[PDB]
């Protein structure tokens with residue numbers, strides 16, 4: 229269950245390893261993985277489309293995927309998660325960046341804090357649906373991405 | 378000849394239109410474009426290779442191109458030049474971003490500034506060889522990338 233508030237027990241050594249195993253295949257193809265994930269989240273959540281100005285005009289899966297702006301945006305969203313997994317052994321480091329990234333969303337991108345957990349699930353489902361460990365990493369990211377609000 | 382110091386005359390309207398016409402084709406396939414340019418720079422400029430710590434172990438086009446790191450790095454570079462062509466009508470914003478990038482290069486990445494113009498040339502020969510207009514933009518960017526040095 230991915231949350232964006234409250235507390236989440238630390239990540240066991242066992243969980244971390246699994247996460248790295250599942251994420252590797254996905255990331256090795258981040259250009260595609262990021263897109264498909266972002267686009268699905270987009271299309272499946274109409275209420276959160278007004279927060280992607282550079283996407284305006286496009287609404288169908290076909291369009292989105294051919295858009296360079298949709299691609300560049302997907303690649304950054306995905307790498308932000310990669311940086312997270314590659315830093316599960318440093319909570320102080322992970323939190324600082326995500327607190328920074330939280331600031332941009334709240335202060336600059338002005339995105340609704342309620343869609344982070346939604347996109348996160350669209351990531352957990354693709355990376356390893358059902359993994360309590362991965363949903364735990366997400367809960368950590370979502371909690372951080374709301375720290376600025 | 379691209380330069381990285383002093384100054385250069387503003388880009389005329391004609392030059393801006395020429396630049397945006399030659400750029401579109403290249404940026405359209407940026408995931409591929411960037412990677413081609415980067416590898417061409419890297420492989421052809423030995424001394425500058427030590428400045429790419431994450432490519433530790435790769436020195437051939439084949440190994441490079443098939444790397445997530447090399448591409449992510451290339452995608453970010455090519456996209457910074459894109460922001461630049463996108464801001465030809467607002468040199469202020471262009472400079473703000475480029476100055477920030479300059480600081481990152483001189484502080485975190487510890488990169489020798491002599492190479493900005495060389496990588497810029499690789500981009501010039503790829504987008505529009507010989508075009509004085511584009512060369513000027515590259516000069517503008519390099520002068521800006523060295524401002525924090």
Ligand code: HEM
Pocket residue numbers: 276279280281282301304305306307308309329332333337339340343344347348373
């Ligand atoms: C899984 C959680 C998310 C992560 C890890 C994430 C990560 C990122 C990253 C790395 C950037 C790059 C910012 C930069 O270049 O400085 C970004 C940009 C952006 N994100 Fe998120 N994001 C997430 C969820 C969301 C959600 C739910 C929305 C929509 C409500 C959203 C909307 C945006 C917007 C508007 C931009 C700016 C695009 C631009 O103007 O270039 N993000 N995000």
Ligand code: HEM
Pocket residue numbers: 425428429430431450453454455457458478481482486488489492493496497
């Ligand atoms: C046209 C010239 C150049 C542009 C526009 C450019 C742009 C960029 C951008 C946008 C980043 C992303 C930083 C971030 O993620 O916040 C970056 C990182 C980096 N650049 Fe450059 N760059 C240029 C030339 C060079 C040159 C000549 C070298 C090598 C001598 C170089 C070495 C690096 C390194 C080592 C990093 C850090 C990579 C990492 O650890 O992720 N760059 N550059």
